[PDB]
């Protein structure tokens, strides 16, 4: 069946250079298909009114690089300072609760998801023996937008956003901010991407962990 | 005497009407903020308040069992049809699992913060949770910023209104960038709080009420 809810997400992680990646922040925006089929506009795009959201910070065991600390604006010490544990059972219960609130099937959407977000999410969940609904699929907007453009450049969020909306995203550089920016980009090309999703979305069960 | 809270969970409800019609939650948003973010409010180089970077957020929409009022649908921008079109169930087990997971991610004790909470948000949340037999963490306390701010102003000494919008306009002299939504209203509330953080933290430390002492608005 077609996915009924699209769950846009972004992860911020550290420790990748050690091949010991550990999520520091995750943000998810859940949007029903109908909202994407029929975008709202004020003349510019605005986000759907009916939108579920979950943003959770986690103190990673491994440190950010100074480049990824200036951008994201996190430090491992500061997440600790605000009293956050790591990616644990409580994160899993919250996430699974959140996903159960969505009409299935779910399509996870992440920019550069196949190379970063999805295998990273997969590693953390498998570490905790946690599974998503077996009908869950996922969509990486990076190859989608490349693929679509070829059917007729930089493919970063920053660049894509500037090329579709004339201006720079005032969205803070965070997981939540990045998902905001991604959802707008998706909305701007929604009929194409919905079509891409129907034909190209990958089963979540196919996704392999880092490990 | 209330415990010292380590996490302040700012929340707003968008409901289907006023108390007299046994309203239901159509939207809940929560912003969880560690006490230290409130004790030292971060400001950009231009010197204006900004939101804390370590900020957990949860926003959930729900289709009510009974209809909206005309006014509530207008205020909230939600309707039963739209929530139903988007496949949202009512306030159910899944909502409770998500909320309880979210709260368990916070360093306790937790102080819930809601504007006009003692009269509306807390008794409404209490009704919905009690209907499902759900409990919050044992030492949870509550702060209502409306009587808190009125009380602080009486001691410290305008202006007349203590509505959320009035307070934001007075303190920041601009319209909120909020979306006239639960999340937008929590955002507006957190900024109001930050504007008077040490006063309100002190108030909470001595005046915050036990969640366990909150009564349901009605029997569902």
Author numbering:
A (entry chain B): 5 to 46, 49 to 158, 168 to 226
B (entry chain A): 3 to 159, 166 to 228
The article reads:
The three prime repair exonuclease 2 (TREX2) is an essential 3′-to-5′ exonuclease that functions in cell proliferation, genome integrity and skin homeostasis maintenance. TREX2 belongs to the family of DEDDh exonuclease, which was named after the four invariant acidic residues and one general base residue in the active site, consisting of more than 17 000 members involved in various DNA and RNA metabolism pathways. The exonuclease activity of TREX2 is responsible for removing the 3′-mismatched sequence of duplex DNA and is associated with cell proliferation and DNA repair. In this study, we present four new crystal structures: apo-TREX2, TREX2 in complex with two different dsDNA substrates, and TREX2 in complex with a processed dsDNA product.
